[PDB]
Amino acid sequence: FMVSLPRMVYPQPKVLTPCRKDVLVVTPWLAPIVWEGTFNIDILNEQFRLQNTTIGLTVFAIKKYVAFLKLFLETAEKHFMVGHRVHYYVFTDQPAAVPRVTLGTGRQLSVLEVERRFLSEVDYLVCVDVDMEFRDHVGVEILTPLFGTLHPSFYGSSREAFTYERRPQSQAYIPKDEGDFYYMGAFFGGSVQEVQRLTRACHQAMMVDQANGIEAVWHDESHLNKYLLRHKPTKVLSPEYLWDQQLLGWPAVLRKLRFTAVP
Ligand SMILES: O=c1ccn([C@@H]2O[C@H](COP(=O)(O)OP(=O)(O)O)[C@@H](O)[C@H]2O)c(=O)[nH]1
Ligand SMILES: CO[C@@H]1O[C@H](CO)[C@@H](O[C@@H]2O[C@H](CO)[C@H](O)[C@H](O)[C@H]2O)[C@H](O)[C@H]1O
Ligand SMILES: [Cl-]
Ligand SMILES: [Hg+2]
Ligand SMILES: [Hg+2]
Ligand SMILES: [Hg+2]
Ligand SMILES: [Hg+2]
Ligand SMILES: [Hg+2]
Ligand SMILES: [Mn+2]
């Protein structure tokens, strides 16, 4: 049961005026491709707040990667799901090394030293790399049952150029005539149920490869791509959500650089 939205005043959408004329904003299976200009964040914030949505953000920080936590968490506080309930889950081998970052109200952080817990604590799970920083808004526009993010190095490439696992002996195998996009393993998510299904499928597939004495060319990312090929994501995030300005600059097609690699 979803409550009704309140009266809102905003620009009327124009049926005969395309959102963006420079990029694809919807996939062939009718999943929105999230680019700046395609969404009214006020409407989306209302929809998700009315459901008291809680987003879990998971990050792994092992060995020297614990050094990336301060900037990651501090910038997430400024740009990630602001206004909504957020639960950070930091998986680390050095609990005492996690920085003391000040959090806004309605936001919490749990340290797990290295789950049915996720199902009862959050509505959506967002899984990202820790050696990153938020530079702009990353909000509820990304929430959906299952989403993948376009790899910044292949968004304009042909499927034949995609670095999928090409060996038939691997469970992550994808032939040259298949593939929608090349998703980067550094940023994916969805409902807890869908994320756990994906993680479970990949874990089992990797065990099979290991038993067959083979390791996918790009490990977890290769399996993620195989999964998303066979289970189409309900939303795809544009490269605005996974960029590297030092290596790729700032092209016009990107109106905002939201989540980037740390040099
Ligand atoms: O020694 C390591 C190596 C990797 N990671 C985690 O694994 C992620 C992905 O691997 P990495 O970032 O090192 O390579 P990349 O994703 O940039 O190709 C890192 O962001 C961390 O979240 C970690 O915690 N400790
Ligand atoms: C310009 O060539 C591209 O350079 C990128 C940055 O080194 C490479 O990024 C890697 O891409 C891999 C998959 O092909 C993995 O995603 C890996 O984690 C990335 O660092 C890119 O491969 C290469 O084509
Ligand atoms: Cl992750
Ligand atoms: Hg638009
Ligand atoms: Hg996760
Ligand atoms: Hg994760
Ligand atoms: Hg998989
Ligand atoms: Hg995966
Ligand atoms: Mn990384």
How far apart CA 97 and CA 105 sit, in angstroms, is: 23
Residue carrying the six token digits 């905002």:
256
- Joined tokens for residue 212: 């067959």
- Joined tokens for residue 231: 């289970």
**After which residues does the chain show a gap where C to N exceeds 2.5 Å?**
114
Structure-determination approach: X-ray
Residues 6+ apart with CB under 8 A from 249: none
Residue carrying the six token digits 């620009």:
11
- By three-state DSSP, how is residue 36 classified? coil
- 77, 133, 194, 221: the catalytic one is 221
221 in catalytic set: yes
Strand duo 85-92 + 107-113: pairing: parallel
Residue 42, annotated as binding a ligand: no
The answer to whether the CB of 162 is under 6 A from ligand 2 is: no
**Other residues' Cβ atoms within 10 Å of the Cβ of residue 133:** 19
Report the candidate in 64, 123, 134, 53 with the shortest Cα–Cα distance to residue 93.
64
In the sheet with 107-113, reading across from the earlier edge strand, the strands are: 33-34, 235-237, 146-149, 187-191, 124-128, 54-61, 85-92, 107-113
Residue 55, annotated as binding a ligand: no
Q: Phi and psi of 211, rounded to 5°?
A: -70, -30
How far apart CA 107 and CA 51 sit, in angstroms, is: 16
How far apart CA 217 and CA 192 sit, in angstroms, is: 27
Residue 62, annotated as binding a ligand: yes
Structural domains in the chain, sorted by start:
1-263 (3.90.550.10)
What's the 200 CA to ligand 5 centre distance in angstroms?
11
Q: Phi and psi of 38, rounded to 5°?
A: -90, -15
Resolution of this deposited model, Å: 1.7
Residues within a 6 A CB radius of ligand 1: 59-63, 65, 129-131, 186
Residues 6+ apart with CB under 8 A from 235: 31, 32, 33, 34, 142, 143, 144, 146, 147
Residue carrying the six token digits 């049952």:
145
Residues 6+ apart with CB under 8 A from 124: 53, 54, 55, 56, 143, 189, 190, 191, 192
Question: Could you tell me the CA-to-CA distances from 107 to 80, 156, 203, 208 in Å, in that order?
Answer: 11, 37, 30, 39
- By three-state DSSP, how is residue 57 classified? strand
Residue carrying the six token digits 């060996």:
167
